[PDB]
Amino acid sequence: LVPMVIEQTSRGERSFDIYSRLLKERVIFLTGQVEDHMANLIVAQMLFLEAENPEKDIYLYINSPGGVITAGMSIYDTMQFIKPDVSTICMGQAASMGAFLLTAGAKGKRFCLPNSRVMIHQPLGGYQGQATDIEIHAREILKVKGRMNELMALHTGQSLEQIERDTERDRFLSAPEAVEYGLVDSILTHRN
């Protein structure tokens, strides 16, 4: 169930769902696993806001345990293509792909909650078949791992060698450590 709200306007009263009301204010929600359907829905929201206003900041709240890689890279390229600065906030948790979209936000407009948690690891995969096919899928996933580390270093500012060592296994980063690591800019403890 989704609660309905009333937006008082000069023309009259209008009924909106809670998710649609926030969309009007340049706010998008990224919840659950990242898949082709959920990812393709967020892209349409960003494009809709670009045409309405290209000079207003967009806010992206992320609470997700990660998911498909190809579905997430479509969002990253979109955020960089459009002119508006996509502000990112981490709520609850940010897995491998959720962390990549978090750090990919506009510089200076990235935040993490005081009790949020980030986790980063290497891409996961697998294949069953002939040895010739396993070599192909192995080279492909290796390129993605190398490609994902290069972009992570660009936004985090760290060196490529450091990202390779830290992403060999699961690594959890608290909210204070994320600031020191260049993943985010500050923490929104209280409203001032």
- Whether 170 is catalytic: yes
Q: How many CB atoms lie within 10 A of CB 81?
A: 10
The active-site residue, picked from 64, 96, 116, 155, is: 96
121 catalytic per annotation: yes
Catalytic one among 85, 121, 174, 185?
Answer: 121
Of the residues 17, 57, 77, 170, only one is catalytic, namely 170
Three-state helix/strand/coil letters over the chain: CCCEEEEECCCCEEEEEHHHHHHHCCEEEEECCECHHHHHHHHHHHHHHHHHCCCCCEEEEEEECCECHHHHHHHHHHHHHCCCCEEEEEEEEECHHHHHHHHCCCCCCEEECCCCEEEECCCCCCCCCCHHHHHHHHHHHHHHHHHHHHHHHHHHCCCHHHHHHHCCCCEEEEHHHHHHCCCCCEECCCCC
178 in Cβ contact with 184 (< 8 Å): yes
β pairing state of 4-8 and 13-17:
antiparallel
- Catalytic center residues: 96, 121, 170
